[PDB]
Amino acid sequence: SRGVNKVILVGNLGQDPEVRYMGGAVANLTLATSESWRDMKEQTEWHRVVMFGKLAEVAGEYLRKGSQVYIEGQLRTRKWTDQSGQERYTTEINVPQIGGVMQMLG
Amino acid sequence: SRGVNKVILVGNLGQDPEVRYMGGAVANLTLATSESWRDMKEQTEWHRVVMFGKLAEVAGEYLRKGSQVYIEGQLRTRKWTDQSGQERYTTEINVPQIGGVMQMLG
């Protein structure tokens, strides 16, 4: 490991977490961070978040469509093909099994 | 204002910073974070970083291709339509001119 790749988020799940398996468990969820402007104009940011193992497993048993959470992980930009067939890029927040934290807040 | 959007990075640039103007000065650069894991794989992450104003113009005079730098900012995913006319999204680490940090290391 050479450099630092850390992202801290406190925000609310926009929708329920989606947990899948392959045989490790994966959980995807989207949280929001807001800020306020006055010319009241808000600005919500959506954060593609993905967790693995127990952390994923816990997210399923307890996280909901409004739950608030603290997340520690690293930026990871992954490539994929769209139906039109061109490799596209989506940047998510990886929450590593060893090194990443998540916590429900309430 | 409402939630916590925070990201911390320590890594080295891949290419000389790109500074332009509008409006106040804007500076784009990309830096690398590397990692190692078993079953030894090296996966370099590349991070689109953008600063404005005082930070930007400083980045120009001092930062070059191999420099190490510390970064504090927030994630920002912006939406845009391309030339062929499909929607695309880009996720950057915005270094707000108010509250964002940058430091050269050595």
Residue numbers in the entry:
A (entry chain A), B (entry chain B): 3 to 24, 27 to 43, 49 to 115
From the primary publication:
Single-stranded DNA (ssDNA)-binding proteins (SSBs) play a central role in cells by participating in DNA metabolism, including replication, repair, recombination, and replication fork restart. SSBs bind tightly and cooperatively to ssDNA, regardless of sequence, and prevent premature annealing and unwanted nuclease digestion. Most, but not all, bacterial SSBs are active as homotetramers, in which four oligonucleotide/oligosaccharide-binding (OB) folds form a DNA-binding domain. In this study, we determined the crystal structure and examined the size of the ssDNA-binding site of an SSB from Salmonella enterica serovar Typhimurium LT2 (SeSSB), a ubiquitous opportunistic pathogen which is highly resistant to antibiotics.
The SeSSB structure was determined at a resolution of 2.8 Å. Two monomers (subunit A and B) of the SeSSB were found in the asymmetric unit. Given that the oligomerization state of bacterial SSBs in solution is tetrameric, the crystallographically related tetramer A-B-A′-B′ is also shown. In both of the subunits, only the N-terminal ssDNA-binding domain (residues 1–115) was ordered and observed. Even in the N-terminal domain, residues in the loops L12 (residues 25–26) and L23 (residues 44–48) were disordered and unobserved. The core of the OB-fold in the SeSSB is made of a six-stranded β-barrel capped by an α-helix. The GGRQ motif, proposed as a regulatory switch for ssDNA binding, and the PXXP motifs, known to mediate the protein–protein interactions, were disordered and disappeared in our crystal structure. The corresponding residues in the SeSSB are W55, F61, and W89, which may play a similar role to that of EcSSB in ssDNA binding. Hydrogen bonds and salt bridges were formed at the dimer–dimer interface of the SeSSB: S3(A)–Q111(B′), G5(A)–Q111(B′), G5(B)–Q111(A′), Q111(A)–G5(B′), Q111(B)–S3(A′), and Q111(B)–G5(A′). The native molecular mass for SeSSB was approximately four times the mass of the monomer and therefore the SeSSB was a stable tetramer.
